Amino acid sequence: KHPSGIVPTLQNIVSTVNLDCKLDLKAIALQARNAEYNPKRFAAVIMRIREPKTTALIFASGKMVCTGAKSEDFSKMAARKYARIVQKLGFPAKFKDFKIQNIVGSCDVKFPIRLEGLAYSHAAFSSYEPELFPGLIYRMKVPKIVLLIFVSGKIVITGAKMRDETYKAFENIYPVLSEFRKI
DNA sequence: GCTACAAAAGGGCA
DNA sequence: TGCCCTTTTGTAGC
């Protein structure tokens, strides 16, 4: 499962669910204290809960985005809790088509990387402009995943909709990272 | 408290 | 149109 002997830690999960009902945002924004709303700035009511620590963007259309959870299950859990809060408020809220939209992971290979060398050998995948951003942007094709590689050996993997995509991207990159270990 | 990246949802505006 | 808007999170040099 994990040949490199390293398991990326899941850091942020983004999901969406359909409450399947139109919502009155100003009413929700008035009844709730755990809520914010400035339509002039953004179309959603921003709401937050402590456990699991997350932030939901709630729309009039009944759709909802959930951010900040550390796992897929935590994300679904937080979404149901927001859905329960909306119900207590007077809306016939359901929970339709809950879907994990993005998973962000990170790990430490515990060795320095020669980013310049890596980018040169993988030009068709690499974006390295150190004066702009200190990390090398690696757009992997299979799985379709974006990895941010730093000189420190710190790696961020984002864009996954399944956690096995996150693990594979990392196992795919590990041998390349070793090839460009900074001695 | 910006550079960079992924992703969703919506109003607004070239 | 599509591209911002907003939110989250890791990373790191400015």
From Swiss-Prot:
It is found in: Nucleus. InterPro entries: TBP (IPR000814), TBP_CS (IPR030491), TBP_dom_sf (IPR012295), TBP_eukaryotic (IPR033710). GO terms for cellular component: nucleus. GO terms for molecular function: DNA binding. Belongs to the TBP family. General transcription factor that functions at the core of the DNA-binding multiprotein factor TFIID. Binding of TFIID to the TATA box is the initial transcriptional step of the pre-initiation complex (PIC), playing a role in the activation of eukaryotic genes transcribed by RNA polymerase II. This is TATA-box-binding protein 1.
